Write a protein that binds this ligand. Sequence first.
Ligand SMILES: [Zn+2]
Ligand SMILES: [Zn+2]
Ligand SMILES: [Zn+2]
Lengths: 81, 77, 250, 151, 144, 121, 316, 111
Amino acid sequence: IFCRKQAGVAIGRLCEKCDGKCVICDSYVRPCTLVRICDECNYGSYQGRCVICGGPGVSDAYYCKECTIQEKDRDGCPKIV
Amino acid sequence: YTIHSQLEHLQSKYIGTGHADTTKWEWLVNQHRDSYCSYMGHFDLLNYFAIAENESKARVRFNLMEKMLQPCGPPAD
Amino acid sequence: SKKKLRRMNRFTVAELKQLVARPDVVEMHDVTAQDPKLLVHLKATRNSVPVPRHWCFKRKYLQGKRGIEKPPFELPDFIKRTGIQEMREALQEKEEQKTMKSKMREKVRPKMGKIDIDYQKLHDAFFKWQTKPKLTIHGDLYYEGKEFETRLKEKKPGDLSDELRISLGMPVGPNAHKVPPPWLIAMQRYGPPPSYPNLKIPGLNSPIPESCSFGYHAGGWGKPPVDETGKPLYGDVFGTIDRTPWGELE
Amino acid sequence: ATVYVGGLDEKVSEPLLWELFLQAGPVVNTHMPKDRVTGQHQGYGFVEFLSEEDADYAIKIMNMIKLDVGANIFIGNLDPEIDEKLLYDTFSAFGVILQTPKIMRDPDTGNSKGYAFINFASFDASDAAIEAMNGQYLCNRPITVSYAFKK
Amino acid sequence: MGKDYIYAVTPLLEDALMDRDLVHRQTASAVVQHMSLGVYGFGCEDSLNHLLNYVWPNVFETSPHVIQAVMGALEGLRVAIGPCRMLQYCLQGLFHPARKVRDVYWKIYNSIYIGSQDALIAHYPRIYNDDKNTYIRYELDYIL
Amino acid sequence: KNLPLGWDGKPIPYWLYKLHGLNINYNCEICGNYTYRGPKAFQRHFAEWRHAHGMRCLGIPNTAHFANVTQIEDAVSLWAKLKLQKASERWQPDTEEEYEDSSGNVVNKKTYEDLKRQGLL
Amino acid sequence: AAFSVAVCRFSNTGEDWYVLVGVAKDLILNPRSVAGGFVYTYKLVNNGEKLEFLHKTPVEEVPAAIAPFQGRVLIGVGKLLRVYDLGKKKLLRKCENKHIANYISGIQTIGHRVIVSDVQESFIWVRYKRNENQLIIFADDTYPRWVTTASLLDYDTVAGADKFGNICVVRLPPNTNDEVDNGASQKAEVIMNYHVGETVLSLQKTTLIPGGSESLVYTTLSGGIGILVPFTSHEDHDFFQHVEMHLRSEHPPLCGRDHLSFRSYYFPVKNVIDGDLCEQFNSMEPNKQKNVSEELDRTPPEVSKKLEDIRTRYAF
Amino acid sequence: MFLYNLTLQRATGISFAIHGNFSGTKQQEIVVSRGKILELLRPDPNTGKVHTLLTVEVFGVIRSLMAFRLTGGTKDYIVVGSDSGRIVILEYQPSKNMFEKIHQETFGKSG
Ligand SMILES: [Zn+2]
Ligand SMILES: [Zn+2]
Ligand SMILES: [Zn+2]
């Protein structure tokens, strides 16, 4: 399930369990570009969380270079809410 | 099927997609509109047409955007 | 019933075949399609690629491959050459003979570096002898049993093989020209094809292949088949620029 | 159209069979639908050349292509220019060959004087083959075949 | 740096795309996906064409993992091989009698369309105009 | 019970018979009003012999273009327009390849050689 | 409306040149419709310093292309590819071929081959067998390409422009059964694919500066002029290959785009390096100039000189 | 074949233009767009000769070009809408003679 309400300028973050993988491609490598999320899945208790685990925002969700070659990173906040 | 809520949201997201029942009319008219939006966007096919007919870029894009409304005949039934 | 009135719109396959501009396409179920004029124009477009066979079938994709026995995959030459396969066969036989106790004994006291295979053998295979396999161009979907027939559509007569020559009685090599095969003999005797014929036999309906020999023993060309007035059986059984590429690497 | 591939060779593959079918004319079908047990060639096959005269002349051409109660036949005026497998296949059109054609050639040289004897399957087989090739067209010296003598 | 071993590996993937099992074809399809995204732009498109021939038949499938890896292989293969080739694979089954085949082809063409909807403008066929509509694009065949 | 044969020559059981749908018969007029049970059977028949013969004697080759056209008047009108198109797209030098005489006026290849070799040109 | 021109001397006559002009009649453009074509021959007199009219043969269509070919002229008139020889009442047709898909906007012909180039499908290789006097197809392309002009690079290779931006080079496979008798028999392959960026309206195989190696000049529709230049050594090739493979990654375009995808807009790139991205190393920044030239482990001198000199030996 | 692509003469035709004080002064600069090119000229008032200061590649299509001034600042930013799914914000550095990317916002797909 996806948020997909369109993108913004607020970076996303990763818990430490979820540390390292891309958001969708589920890679572990060659991350190129930073993730951005929507205000609605940006506010409040959802500030600085794990887009996947829900855990605390510590490490930065990133985008596997394949995902940027196919521009699957131009859709917005992909938060599994 | 919540996948489908999202997927006809996708049909609502991308004007020009299809589904297994889509009609030759919707298909070809959507491709025709897209053709127009790109003749406008790409700065050079505009010169191609401007020069092919003896019109001028304002004339050209005005025609195009008028045609964008019923480009491929009237509707199906 | 409204589907049934559109079903009365559901025209005849001859209706289609006669309407259409390209009739090769028209198939069985084409007609129960909501827009057969489209469907057929599409299927008659250039370069397009038709649906697989097997949407009709009740059996799933290769459950029909189920039955047979199949031989293991065959490596590329340039990888056999580097002699990996024998290393691996040897290690296999070793470790299938060895017993559990000895297995764990080797776990605790390893045979470190039993073998070696040096580099530049590998790096030259992969970077100096790697070569284009056989590929199939746009369109030729693989369907079940397709490999069941190795190759075809060489309707040409001159196409001969060396095992063909050997197991037919004819010669292999530079003599595949000057060797008229045992079928050109009855080509000269009673003819080529009645409605096909567009093939001429070398030494029987074509001229002498390079340095052929006329004579009636084993190893010659015999009587080039001719009429009683002198005109051959067909053709002539006796016999009477700058293609440089512009951008190319040094 | 339909042609009997007789003396159908075991390993002589249907692929090159169809390639010769094409090198003669309309290669439309090459089939030797074999035993349901063996897989190898079953002695008679169907070769369809979709033109009748095509198959006729292709047959005239691909004939002779080199694919104990006395069932041995003497065959003289013999063609010295043959090979073993080709001669065996030609003899076997009317039966099996329980002994390939032993050519009574001189031993001084290795070149024959024109006689042989061949163990076929049946005496009626030697009859039919020796009849169809009595005086008939051998390679260079016309054939002359019949029941064989005993040595 | 797959532009080197793509040739070595193809005859093994074609081997395992001619059936061996569900999981066999699911996995060979994943391999095709990643090869295509690696070899984007280095010209090894004949090899990915060859493997399209073998992957595309699995299009009618049911198992979720299998059809899903197939669809992934076709997005990868879409960037690596271009969207003409794949629109041509997707042409004839858009308007098919059936509905299982209509639906799979419209699923694919949807994903081919979303990404790279703008190339296709030069890849669409020529679809003649009947009586009361206009369907040809005369814009594109002005001479000059 | 009319139950179709198996390899071991027995009835085929009923759910299987229904699957194979033998009940449905196809009137192939080309084949001597032969009529076929089994759909893919029907289809392969179009290249089977009886259809081949039918074609030959119809006066029209067994090329694919008519396969699944089973009525003979349809076949002949189909092959009629097909004939027309083949003759069209043929380039015939007789009517196309055209020759001016010396006199500043033009004819075709045929008429040029005609009056050429019957003593003027 | 005159749309095609060629100067030719038929060999039945001598060195009295004639200009041929295609002149269509009463056209409309967005419907399509025509009245008819006419073939204007002029005798090009005053040693070639004024034309005097000879004849205007009527013909079926807008006669959009004329080509001098082996003592006669090939003419595209819409769907027809007809071979013409000369009279002074009219123009007489010695051959016809009728299989071209839509509309023949180009004819370019080597000593005895023809590369017709229709308006939508492709280049289509056509053969003239003189003794039977036939015009017969043997090899065409596998794509649609709305061509605007093509060029010959050899006996088997043809370069094409395209209305949407692209240039491509298409080559016949090396083994073509030239003489014989979906919709084709055997086809050609594509060996390069480049999205120039603007409509390319004329290619030409040429060398500019004296003794400079050969080249392709392309001249677009927006005031752009350029060249595509071969490589002689996998050392050069691999060099710039890596140069730009890094340049994309660390110095992307300004306007949001990706360079790989912009140059593979319609059909993917194949065997063309972006000299105009490479030549940007100069205007880059010392930090990045370092970083990349150190990946190459050459000095920014080595790179920049190897950049400049490759234009030096081809162009200016 | 293996080819190298070089442009001798840039595209000259003009499609879009804006005028603004793109160097902060009250000497005005003009930013025009060729096809896939952003070129900046400054017209000298003395002779009346326009010097083409900065000619840059952008590898895209400029579909839309509009300058803007912040409420009270002395600079003249550029907003470029091109054929990627992004809006981009540009500025001039005369110190380096180079266009500078302030911000960057994706909103969709390419082409
Ligand atoms: Zn991801
Ligand atoms: Zn949200
Ligand atoms: Zn987490």
